[PDB]
């Protein structure tokens, strides 16, 4: 088929933060098509992969991956909190990120 996508698109918005203090260990993710926590309740526990490119080849590729999970919903608009093995570099605010369908529950 023309489309091979098996993930839902997301945008890294910001770290957990107050007015003056942010917490890099937790990240805020906006999922396309989700506008309420009840719908976002379906998406907890899924794996999140951030795909970026580098000039130097490490182990056979130009692509390096950040792996992370969502932990709980955030706010009334379906935003969710996500954590990763290594926190996102903070230059990815507004960058597109991948949310997969596993571990599935259906």
């Amino acid at each position: 088929a023309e489309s091979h996508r098996l993930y839902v698109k997301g945008k890294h918005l910001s770290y957990q933060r107050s007015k003056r203090v942010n917490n890099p260990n937790v990240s805020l993710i906006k999922i396309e098509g989700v506008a309420t926590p009840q719908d976002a309740q379906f998406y907890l526990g899924k794996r999140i992969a951030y795909v970026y490119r580098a000039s130097k080849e490490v182990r056979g590729s130009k692509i390096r991956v950040m792996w992370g999970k969502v932990t709980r919903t955030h706010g009334n608009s379906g935003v969710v909190r996500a954590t990763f093995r290594n926190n996102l570099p903070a230059k990815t605010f507004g960058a597109s990120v991948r949310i997969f369908l596993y571990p599935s529950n259906i």
Binding site: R5, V8, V34, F42
Partner: protein, 167 residues
């Protein structure tokens, strides 16, 4: 001397672990997974391919066949956590899946000294697959368009919402 001495040395004897009380009992797999349901592979080489479920194996895994004749997925073992169970149902009575078990699939890892960059299949696996799939396709051939359905590949489009989608 340079560093004088430690007066007491720690004991060299390793201690035994305590008696663990974590017994093992079988999975309570979700009710949507019934032998004969049609599944989708979400990961691996054959990700996105619609397939048939046969048996719940002993190492908490599912026995799966394509059928290999329709789409090219052979007898393969998968995990229930990476598949989606559809409402489409295939009657799987009359097939002998009891032959397959965990030791039916062994890898025979090679020695680290022998490493090959240049580079096969077992005949018995081939003949079991050919026996089983030819029996299944006798039943898939009943319901119209389902053969083409299995030949097709699952894929999300624009506008699809999995939280609202039905499978």
């Amino acid at each position: 001397t340079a560093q004088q001495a430690p007066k007491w040395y720690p004991s060299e004897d390793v201690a035994a672990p305590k008696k663990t009380r974590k017994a093992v009992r079988p999975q309570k797999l979700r009710a949507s997974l019934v032998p004969g349901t049609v599944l989708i592979l979400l990961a691996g080489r054959f990700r996105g391919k619609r397939v048939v479920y046969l048996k719940h194996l002993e190492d908490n895994t599912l026995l799966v066949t394509g059928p290999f004749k329709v789409n090219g997925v052979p007898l393969r073992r998968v995990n229930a956590r990476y598949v989606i169970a559809t409402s489409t149902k295939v009657s799987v009575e009359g097939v002998n899946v009891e032959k397959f078990n965990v030791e039916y699939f062994a890898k025979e890892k090679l020695t680290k000294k022998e490493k090959k960059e240049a580079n096969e299949i077992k005949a018995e696996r081939v003949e079991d697959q050919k026996v089983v799939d030819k029996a299944l396709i006798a039943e898939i051939k009943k319901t119209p368009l389902l053969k083409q359905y299995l030949s097709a590949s699952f894929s999300l489009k624009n506008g699809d919402k999995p939280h609202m989608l039905k499978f």
